[PDB]
Structure formats: structure tokens, C-alpha cells
Amino acid sequence: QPVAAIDSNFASFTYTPRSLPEDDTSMAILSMLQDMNFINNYKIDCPTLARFCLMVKKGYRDPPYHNWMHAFSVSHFCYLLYKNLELTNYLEDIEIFALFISCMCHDLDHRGTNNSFQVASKSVLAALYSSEGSVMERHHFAQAIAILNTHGCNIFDHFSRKDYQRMLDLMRDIILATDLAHHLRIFKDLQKMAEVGYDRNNKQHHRLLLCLLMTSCDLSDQTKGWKTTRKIAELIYKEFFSQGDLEKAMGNRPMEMMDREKAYIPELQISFMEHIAMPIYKLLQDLFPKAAELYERVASNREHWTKVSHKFTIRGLPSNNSLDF
Amino acid sequence: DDEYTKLLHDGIQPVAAIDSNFASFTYTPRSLPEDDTSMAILSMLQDMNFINNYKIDCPTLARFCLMVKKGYRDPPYHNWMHAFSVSHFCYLLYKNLELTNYLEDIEIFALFISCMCHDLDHRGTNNSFQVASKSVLAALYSSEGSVMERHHFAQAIAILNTHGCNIFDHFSRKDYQRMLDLMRDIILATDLAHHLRIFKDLQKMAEVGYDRNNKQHHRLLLCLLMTSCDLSDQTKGWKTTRKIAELIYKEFFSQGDLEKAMGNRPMEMMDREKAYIPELQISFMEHIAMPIYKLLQDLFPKAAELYERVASNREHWTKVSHKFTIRGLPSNNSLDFL
Ligand SMILES: [Mg+2]
Ligand SMILES: [Mg+2]
Ligand SMILES: [Zn+2]
Ligand SMILES: [Zn+2]
Numbered sequence: 001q002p003v004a005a006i007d008s009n010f011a012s013f014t015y016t017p018r019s020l021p022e023d024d025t026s027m028a029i030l031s032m033l034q035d036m037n038f039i040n041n042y043k044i045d046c047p048t049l050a051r052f053c054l055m056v057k058k059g060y061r062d063p064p065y066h067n068w069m070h071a072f073s074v075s076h077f078c079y080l081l082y083k084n085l086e087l088t089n090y091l092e093d094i095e096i097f098a099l100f101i102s103c104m105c106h107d108l109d110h111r112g113t114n115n116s117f118q119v120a121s122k123s124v125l126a127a128l129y130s131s132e133g134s135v136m137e138r139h140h141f142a143q144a145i146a147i148l149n150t151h152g153c154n155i156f157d158h159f160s161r162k163d164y165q166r167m168l169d170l171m172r173d174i175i176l177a178t179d180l181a182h183h184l185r186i187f188k189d190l191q192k193m194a195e196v197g198y199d200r201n202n203k204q205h206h207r208l209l210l211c212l213l214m215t216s217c218d219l220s221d222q223t224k225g226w227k228t229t230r231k232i233a234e235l236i237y238k239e240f241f242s243q244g245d246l247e248k249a250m251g252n253r254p255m256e257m258m259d260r261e262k263a264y265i266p267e268l269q270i271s272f273m274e275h276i277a278m279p280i281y282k283l284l285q286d287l288f289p290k291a292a293e294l295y296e297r298v299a300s301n302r303e304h305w306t307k308v309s310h311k312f313t314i315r316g317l318p319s320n321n322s323l324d325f
Numbered sequence: 326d327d328e329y330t331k332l333l334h335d336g337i338q339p340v341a342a343i344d345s346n347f348a349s350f351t352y353t354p355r356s357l358p359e360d361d362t363s364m365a366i367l368s369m370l371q372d373m374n375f376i377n378n379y380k381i382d383c384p385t386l387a388r389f390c391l392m393v394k395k396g397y398r399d400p401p402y403h404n405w406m407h408a409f410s411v412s413h414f415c416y417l418l419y420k421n422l423e424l425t426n427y428l429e430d431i432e433i434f435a436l437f438i439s440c441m442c443h444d445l446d447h448r449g450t451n452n453s454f455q456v457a458s459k460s461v462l463a464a465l466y467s468s469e470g471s472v473m474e475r476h477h478f479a480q481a482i483a484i485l486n487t488h489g490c491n492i493f494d495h496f497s498r499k500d501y502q503r504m505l506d507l508m509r510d511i512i513l514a515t516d517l518a519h520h521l522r523i524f525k526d527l528q529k530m531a532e533v534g535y536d537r538n539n540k541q542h543h544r545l546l547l548c549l550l551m552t553s554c555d556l557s558d559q560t561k562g563w564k565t566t567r568k569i570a571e572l573i574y575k576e577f578f579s580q581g582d583l584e585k586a587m588g589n590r591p592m593e594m595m596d597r598e599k600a601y602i603p604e605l606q607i608s609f610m611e612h613i614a615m616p617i618y619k620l621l622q623d624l625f626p627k628a629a630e631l632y633e634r635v636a637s638n639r640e641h642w643t644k645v646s647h648k649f650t651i652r653g654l655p656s657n658n659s660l661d662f663l
Contacts, residue, residue, distance in 0.1 A: 234660045241653055260653030265660075308663055312651040316578055316597030323571045323602075325648065 001027055003035040011083045013293055016224050017076035018069055018231075025072045029053050029104065032079040038097050042163075044155050052153045056104050059143055063112025064242075065235040075103040077220035081213060085288045090200055090209060094163060098170035099210060101155075103217055105171070106178050108143035110136065113243045115179070120252060134179040141175045170210070177211040178218055180276070186211060187279075194286040209287070216284055216294075222277045222301060223294045229301045233269055266309035273302045328363070332387040338364055340372040348420045350630055353561050354413035355406055355568075362409045363390050366441065369416045375434050381492050389490045393441050396480055400449030401575040412440040414557035418550060422625045427537060427546060431500070435507035436547060438492075440554055442508070443515045445480035447473065450580045452516070457589060471516040478512045507547070514548040515555050517613070523548060524616075531623040546624070553621050553631075559614050559638060560631045566638045570606060603646040610639035 006028055009015045020028060030049065033039055039049070060068040078100045081087055087096050115135040118126040129138040145168075148154050156164050176182060190212055199205050221232040244258030257268050281295040318325060343365055346352045357365060367390065370376050376386065397405040415437045418424060424433055455463040455472045466475040482505070485491045493504050513519060527549055536542050558569040574597075581595035593599050618632040655662065 230660050230663070234654070234658070237654055238658055263653050264650070265654070311663055313601070314649040314651065316600050316602070317571065317574055321571065321575055323567050 001031050001034075003031045006031065011080065013080060013084060013223070013297075015076075015080075016228055017073045018221075018228065020072075022069060022072075025068070026053050026057060029072070029075065032076070033100070036079065036082055036096070036100070038093075038100075041093060042097065043158060045158070048152060048155050048157075052147070052155050053104070055147045055150060055153050056108070056144075059105075059108045059147060061109060061111060063110065064238045065232070066107050066110035066112055066239065071104055071107055074106065074217045074220065075100060077217040077223075078103045078213070081216070085290050087213075090198060091206060094166055095170060095206065095210060098167055099174060099213060099217075101167075102144075102171045102174040102214065105144040105147070106140055106175050106214070106218070108140045108147075110140070112239050113246070115181075117243055117247065120247070120250065134176055134182065137176050137179045140178075141172055144171060144175065173207065174210055174214050177214050180215075183211065183215050183280075190283055194283050198287055212280070212283060212287075215280055219277050219280060222273060223281065223297045224301075225297075226301060226304050229304075233265065237263070237265060264312070266305060266312055270302060270305050270309075273298065273305065278302065329387055329391055332363060332367065332391065333384055337367045337371050337376075340365075340368040343368060348417065350417055350421065350560065350634075351562075352413075352417075353565055354410045355558075355565070357409075359406060359409075362405070363394060366390050366409070366412065369412070370437075373416070373419055373433075373437070375437070378430065379434065380495065382495070385489060385492050385494070389484065389492050390441075392484050392487065392490050393445070396442075396445045396484060398446065398448065400447060401579075402569075402572040403444050403447035403449060403576065408441055408444055411443065411554045411557065412437060414554045414560075415440045415550070418554070422627060424550075427535060428543060431503060432507060432543060432547060435504055436511060436550060436554075438504075439481075439508050439511035439551065442481040442484075443477055443512050443551070443555070445477045445484075447477070449576050450583070452518075453592075454580055454584070457584070458587065471513055471519065474513050474516045477515075478509055481508060481512065510544065511547055511551050514551045520548070520552050520617075527620055531620055535624055549617070549620060549624075552617055556614055556617060559610070560618065560634045562634075563638060563641050566606075566641070570602065574600065574602060601649070603642050603649055606642045607639060610635060610642070615639065 003010050006020070006024070007015065017028075030053065033044075033049065038044065039046070056071070057068050060066075060071060082096060082100075091099075113121075115133075115137075118135045119130045125135055125139050129135045132138060148156065156167050159167065186208070189208055193205055193208050198209065221228055240258040241260040241263070244254035244260060247254040247258070256262055278295070278298050281291065281298050284291040285295045317323070340347060343357065343361070344352060354365075367376075367386070370381075370386070375381065376383075393408075394405050397403075397408060419433065419437075428436075450458075452470075452472045452474075454460075456467050460472075462472050462476050466472045469475065485493065493501055496504065523545065527545055530542055530545050535546065559566055574594075577595045578597040578600070581591035581597060584591040584595065590596075594605050614635050615632070618628070618635050621628045622632045654660065
């Protein structure tokens with residue numbers, strides 16, 4: 001089923017994938033994989049790919065932000081980077097395939113809480129993963145492996161030994177890179193690559209670009225219009241404040257951004273965009289000139305947040321004409 | 326005409342039957358139902374001995390009280406309950422501050438009557454709006470200033486000149502002229518601009534000491550007391566000051582919306598898109614309210630509690646200001662408000 005039949009704007013950076021109905025996202029996944037040629041290129045079995053994608057979608061829970069629609073929109077951005085940035089000029093085909101597959105699986109079985117929360121609550125996930133770090137990301141990867149090994153879901157089962165091993169190592173590294181702590185950890189290396197210039201002969205640069213691109217996809221809701229950033233802030237903060245409510249109950253001090261009594265959304269949001277999102281799309285711009293508009297949308301969305309911040313102070317009366325609050 | 330019939334024929338209820346705390350500074354007259362206010366006016370008049378001392382005709386007094394009440398419209402703040410609450414505070418001053426040591430009986434009577442009448446036919450807009458909107462009131466009075474206040478006074482006289490309502494009609498020519506002059510100065514003194522012009526003279530008066538034998542002192546004291554009555558909602562508890570804030574800004578923001586439709590830029594305190602209520606309230610407490618009650622305390626020591634309540638109410642606004650900034654998400658979990 002052609003990509004062009006979904007919407008004429010599907011491969012544009014202007015397109016908002018969350019506007020696609022959730023019942024159509026699975027075929028949109030197949031259409032993107034076909035449009036990138038990975039089906040014919042790696043001789044993926046069609047019914048297996050079909051069963052795989054349904055398993056991935058079924059593997060997501062329903063918290064406000066970390067759900068299938070997020071995994072879906074992250075994958076679509078990966079497709080957008082393929083179609084708009086000519087990724088084949090920088091990475092091998094298997095690496096692009098791996099990135100896209102990893103985008104689908106990257107938040108599997110997310111519970112709407114961060115890594116710190118898993119450890120503090122002494123969950124099973126923490127017992128299993130806290131000593132290696134990146135608790136939730138190790139779980140996501142493990143859920144992805146458990147899916148691959150379900151009957152009729154292994155899309156790599158015909159791959160050669162070398163290609164099978166490459167896909168698995170790539171998926172692990174890429175899903176692990178989705179811990180923002182990892183991104184911050186490697187930020188200096190990403191800058192160094194961007195300054196010396198990308199070297200496609202350098203396997204180290206391949207890994208680093210894969211990390212940045214993955215991160216760029218995870219944060220891609222910031223690169224659309226105002227409506228998307230506003231809506232996504234609503235979902236993220238609802239999730240944060242729900243975590244903070246659990247922590248307060250445990251007799252723990254939540255961080256400021258998870259404390260609904262104390263959190264000031266405009267400052268948190270502007271800080272997130274100034275100090276995390278923008279420098280990421282700034283690095284992408286340095287490496288890929290065609291990514292310029294991404295960085296420009298983010299900065300523009302940033303200005304919109306500042307221009308709107310004054311609405312968080314109550315001027316005049318509330319609408320009921322009452323001071324009962 | 327049954328309201329008049331009952332006011333005249335049922336007899337004046339004893340003031341202590343209204344509430345057990347009726348004569349206390351802590352009492353909040355706005356808790357009295359509006360249907361009970363005319364009789365409470367009669368009760369206060371009786372407890373102060375004015376009806377007997379001035380031989381006020383009962384049918385005339387009843388018609389007068391009802392005509393005054395009906396002379397108020399119903400904007401959110403400047404209505405009959407405001408007038409009633411200002412009168413009641415005048416009464417509190419009488420029962421608590423021993424005013425008969427400072428003022429003649431006729432000045433005290435004039436003060437109370439002036440209180441009932443001081444905001445008559447208020448239309449919910451201020452002096453500046455009368456001039457800018459080219460109102461009939463400004464056509465009559467703008468050249469002299471205190472536009473609304475001149476109108477309130479004029480309305481008071483029109484009620485007195487209504488047949489069967491002149492409660493002063495038997496007074497001598499001298500005493501009649503005296504009452505109407507007192508009402509004029511007192512009602513005109515309810516213009517904040519006037520209060521600000523005489524503030525230094527009030528300060529000097531309280532510094533040198535009140536001289537009962539100084540006519541100018543009597544005049545200054547009357548102005549200060551009238552201003553104290555007009556602002557008296559601030560001397561009650563937090564709930565009163567809060568509710569009163571809501572009424573006043575509802576009235577102010579409505580004016581502001583009109584100025585906007587006329588193509589003028591409204592005062593910040595009138596502008597519902599700019600007004601930040603806690604700052605405006607705190608400023609009013611600091612610059613207007615607190616110094617008035619501090620002067621009252623300087624002249625009458627037993628007024629100390631009034632200043633303390635206003636100072637306390639100013640602290641409460643400071644303590645509550647944080648709630649005007651939205652922390653977390655709004656209650657619907659939506660950023661739809663943008
Ligand atoms: Mg994640
Ligand atoms: Mg007035
Ligand atoms: Zn994610
Ligand atoms: Zn008044």
C-alpha cells in the first residue's frame with residue numbers, strides 16, 4: 001500500500017503523524033518499510049512483518065505520553081529523516097533498518113515512570129537492571145527480544161548469522177541510547193564529530209550518528225507546530241505529576257518538574273527546549289543542511305512558549321467572577 | 326405600599342434583637358438580609374436617640390428610609406448594602422468611640438444621614454468616566470469637579486424635597502440650613518481626591534491635638550470619619566475583604582470594558598487583562614486604607630483594633646498572592662487556555 005495514498009504530505013517535515021488514526025498506524029508502518037525498500041531489500045516475509053508490528057503495538061501500555069502513538073510518531077520521524085536527509089549517504093542499509101525497527105520498540109512496556117522511580121520503588125525491573133543502569137531501556141530491549149522470539153514474529157530469522165548479529169547489537173545500542181542520561185553523557189563526542197565533520201569510513205562516527213538520530217526522533221514532537229508542542233506538554237506533565245504523587249505517597253521528595261504543587265510549566269518547558277532540544281537539532285543542522293528547518297521550528301516554538309507564559313499568572317478575576325480559589 | 330405600612334405600624338425593633346454582636350467592630354452588617362435593613366436603620370436611629378431628640382415624624386421617617394433605599398441601583402458594589410454597611414459603621418463609631426465628646430449632636434446626626442445617602446443613584450462608574458463619556462452628570466457638574474458626589478448630594482436633596490419625605494421640615498431656618506450644609510461637606514468628602522487633598526491637615530490635627538472649640542477641627546474630623554465609614558469593609562475579617570474585592574473589581578472591570586468600546590485605554594486597575602489583584606489590593610491597603618485607620622487610632626485610642634484588622638488583612642493578601650500563579654496544570658489537566 002503506497003505511502004502517497006495515506007496523505008500527500010506524509011513525507012514532509014510539516015506532517016503531524018499523531019493526526020493519523022491509531023487503527024491506521026500499523027499499515028502506515030508497513031508502507032514506510034516498503035517505501036524505504038527494506039521489504040524487498042532484505043527479503044522480509046510479509047506475514048511475519050505483519051505479526052511483528054501488531055505484537056510491538058500490543059506491547060505498549062496506556063500511560064498519557066509513553067504509548068504506541070509515541071512509538072509510532074518516533075518511527076515516522078525516522079522515515080522523514082530517511083526521505084529528507086538522504087541517510088543512505090551516511091549509514092549502511094542495515095543501520096537504517098535497525099534504527100527504524102528500534103524506534104518502534106524503544107519504549108515497549110513503558111509504565112509512565114522514569115528510571116529513578118523504578119529503583120526507589122524496588123520494582124522487579126530495578127532488581128534485574130539497576131546495577132547495569134538505564135533500567136527501563138534494558139527492559140524495553142528485553143521486551144523486543146521476547147517479541148522476536150515469539151512464534152511467527154521473527155523478521156530476522158532468514159538473515160545470515162552476521163546480519164542477524166548486527167541487527168541485534170544495533171538494536172541494543174540504539175534502544176540504550178534513548179536514555180537521556182546517555183545522550184548527555186555523550187554530548188561532547190557528538191559535538192566533536194560535528195566539528196571535525198562526519199567520516200563515513202569511521203565506524204565510531206556511525207554509532208554516534210545513530211545515537212543522535214535516535215534522540216532526534218524521540219524528541220521530534222518539538223519540531224512541528226504550536227499545537228503539537230502544547231498538547232505533548234500536557235501529556236508529559238500529566239505523566240510527571242502522576243509519578244510525583246506516587247513519590248510523595250512513599251514519603252519521598254519528587255523533583256521540581258514532577259511536583260504539581262511546585263512545578264512552573266513555562267519555565268520547565270522553555271528550559272527543556274533551550275538546553276536539551278535545541279542543541280540536538282542544532283547538531284543535526286551542522287551535520288545535515290537539509291535539517292535546518294527542524295532547528296528553526298524548535299526555536300520558533302520556544303518563542304511561542306515565552307509569548308504565552310503570562311497566561312500562567314491570573315490577571316483580573318477568574319471566569320466565574322469569583323475569588324473562591 | 327405594604328413595606329411602608331409595616332415599617333410605620335409594627336414598632337421599632339430593639340437594636341439588640343438584630344444580632345447579639347450588632348454593636349461590635351467585629352460584626353459584619355452585610356450578613357443581615359436586605360429585607361431587614363430598613364428596620365435596622367430605624368433601630369439605629371432610635372438607639373442613638375435621634376428620633377426623639379429631633380422629633381422626627383414617624384410617617385415621614387419611614388417614607389424617607391424607603392425612598393433612600395430605592396434611590397440605589399444594583400451595580401456589584403455601589404448598591405444599598407454598601408450604603409447600609411457604611412451607616413452601620415457610623416453607628417459603631419457612635420457606640421464605641423464616644424463621639425459626643427468631639428462633635429455636636431447635629432453633626433453626628435448629619436454624618437449618619439449623609440452615610441445612608443452618600444452614594445445615591447451610583448451607576449457603577451467613576452468621575453473620570455462621567456467626563457470621558459460626556460454624561461449628563463458631567464454636563465451639570467464637570468466644571469466644579471467631584472461629579473458623582475455632587476449628583477449624590479443633589480439626589481439626597483431631591484428626596485428631601487419630595488412631599489412627605491422631608492424629615493427636617495420642622496427645623497428652624499438656621500438648623501435646616503445647618504443640616505444641608507453638613508450633608509454637602511460630608512457627601513463631598515467621600516471623593517478620594519478630596520481626602521488626599523486634606524490628608525496633611527488631618528495629620529496636623531492629630532499631631533497638635535483635637536480642639537473641640539476649633540470649628541475647622543470639627544470639619545476635618547467629619548471628613549475623616551466619613552472616609553472611615555466608606556472604607557469600613559476592610560476592617561472586618563478576611564472573608565469580608567475577599568468578597569468585597571470581588572465586587573469592586575467586577576464593577577471596575579465592567580467600566581474598563583466600556584472604556585475599551587469607546588476606544589480609550591482604561592486604568593490598569595480597570596483593565597481585566599492587566600490588573601493583578603493582590604498588588605492592587607496591597608497598594609490600596611498601604612497607601613489609602615492603613616493611613617486612614619492609623620489617623621483614626623491617633624485621635625481615638627479605642628479605634629486601635631480597626632488599624633490592626635486592616636494591617637492584618639494586608640498581610641493575608643501577601644500570603645495568598647502565590648495562588649494567583651498557576652502551578653502544575655489547571656484542574657482539568659488541559660493547557661487549552663493556552
Ligand atoms: Mg524511553
Ligand atoms: Mg461615592
Ligand atoms: Zn521515547
Ligand atoms: Zn461609598
